[PDB]
């Protein structure tokens, strides 16, 4: 199977620079041009520019000359994406895709989970954890809700996965609220059984990659 | 350079009904291809050349041209097609990408199940109380929470956040949280959020006692 898996979320203070990472397998790497697409959270989708792995031939957004360096490396299959002088208008979403025509004339293309850079001159935070129990005041018609509140970090993003993924149905993730402080917090929320709280056990995995957070609480009645 | 315009911005359509997205184009382009995206996903090809299916794609999907004119159908409007849409165009070595269409489902009136959480021993030994009142699975969107402090209307210490549209029922869920230091948490009784929505034929209230 295709897969393009980018590297985690970043800060950078103004003035910085940034190289984000593609790793690509499940095909010749050599086979397919590499595109780099940013999405600022909330300008849509934009192209930076494309790589060609098999020559080294590269093709450039005007917009993005300047900002950005492209390169790869063969021997590990990965691509890379180099942004300099950092600066606030830079925040966003940075995806690699690889798509091209095969010779056949099928159209190829597949795309990475995303990196969100952040540029600020504020410092990384760690998120505070607190499970929010299954209890009388948390029951609807034989269902019980339950969750994690994920209180005060910096910068996005927070994931959130329940029983390592193995419980999906049911579970409500929350866009981030911004706190008067300029920290952030979310919820994540599941609803389940009331009859097998004492048989299963609710475990949300909470993931901050810009403070390297990573973060099991066991959720109980 | 090629500037193209996508329409609408924005449209809410009935389960099975016919969706038209156009992108209209300055100048006429080599290849038009056609993406979508649900929140917190990376895009999907759909329809690549105008008109060819991508690998996978249903049938209710297609494309067309006429000119500088191109046109996105869904012949038959699913709950899993919510999500935002756009035209991509490559012309002369430079892929362009339109302004986006949000395509939104309608669906029957369903009001919220509430649920409140109090505050677990591990807050209030933090310092701060953040008492959370859950709305699960309700439809249309607009919803109000009120929150009461013994029968006391607050205002200025509460957040709330609302889910995308689910793309299996078309509904939303919604959290607010009220934020009180520990100390003014042990100064009163009744914790209530009271919720207003169109399902609702008057406002529901889920409580609880502190200390119980």
């Known amino acids: 199977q295709v897969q393009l898996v980018q590297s985690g979320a970043e800060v950078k203070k103004p003035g910085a620079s940034v190289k984000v990472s593609c790793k690509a397998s499940g095909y010749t790497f050599t086979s397919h041009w590499m595109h780099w697409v940013r999405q600022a959270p909330g300008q849509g989708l934009e192209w930076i520019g494309e790589?060609?792995?098999?020559?080294?031939?590269?093709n450039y957004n005007e917009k993005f000359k300047s900002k950005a360096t492209m390169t790869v490396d063969t021997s590990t299959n990965t691509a890379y994406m180099e942004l300099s002088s950092l600066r606030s208008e830079d925040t966003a979403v940075y995806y690699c895709?690889?798509?091209?025509?095969?010779?056949?004339?099928?159209?190829?293309?597949?795309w990475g989970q995303g990196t969100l850079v952040t540029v600020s001159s504020a410092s990384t935070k760690g998120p505070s954890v607190f499970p929010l129990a299954p209890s009388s005041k948390s029951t609807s018609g034989g269902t019980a809700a339950l969750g994690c509140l994920v209180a005060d970090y910096f910068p996005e993003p927070v994931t959130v996965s329940w029983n390592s993924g193995a419980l999906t149905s049911g579970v409500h993730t929350f866009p981030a609220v911004l706190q008067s402080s300029g920290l952030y917090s979310l919820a994540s929320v599941v609803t389940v059984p009331s009859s097998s709280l004492g048989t299963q056990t609710y475990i949300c995995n909470v993931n901050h990659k810009p403070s390297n957070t990573k973060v099991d609480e066991k959720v109980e009645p | 350079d090629i500037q193209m315009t996508q329409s609408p911005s924005s449209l809410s359509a009935s389960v099975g009904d016919r969706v038209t997205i156009t992108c209209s184009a300055s100048?006429?382009?080599?290849?038009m291809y056609w993406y979508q995206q649900k929140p917190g996903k990376a895009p999907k090809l759909l329809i690549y050349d105008t008109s060819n299916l991508a690998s996978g794609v249903p049938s209710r999907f297609s494309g067309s041209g006429s000119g500088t004119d191109y046109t996105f159908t869904i012949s038959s409007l699913q709950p899993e097609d919510i999500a935002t849409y756009y035209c991509?165009?490559?012309?002369?070595?430079?892929?362009?990408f339109g302004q986006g269409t949000k395509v939104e489902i309608k669906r029957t009136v369903a009001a919220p199940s509430v649920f409140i959480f109090p505050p677990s021993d591990k807050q209030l030994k933090s310092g701060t109380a953040r008492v959370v009142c859950l709305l699960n699975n309700f439809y249309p969107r607009e919803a109000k929470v009120q929150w009461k402090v013994d029968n006391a209307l607050q205002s200025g210490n509460s957040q709330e956040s609302v889910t995308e549209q689910d793309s299996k029922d078309s509904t939303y869920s919604l959290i607010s949280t009220l934020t009180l230091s520990k100390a003014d948490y042990e100064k009163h009784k009744v914790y209530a959020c009271e919720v207003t929505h169109q399902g609702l034929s008057s406002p529901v209230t889920k409580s609880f006692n502190r200390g119980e």
């Open positions: 790589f060609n792995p098999s020559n080294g031939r590269t």
């Open positions: 100048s006429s382009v080599t290849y």
């Open positions: 895709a690889s798509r091209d025509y095969d010779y056949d004339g099928r159209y190829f293309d597949y």
């Open positions: 991509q165009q490559w012309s002369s070595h430079i892929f362009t």
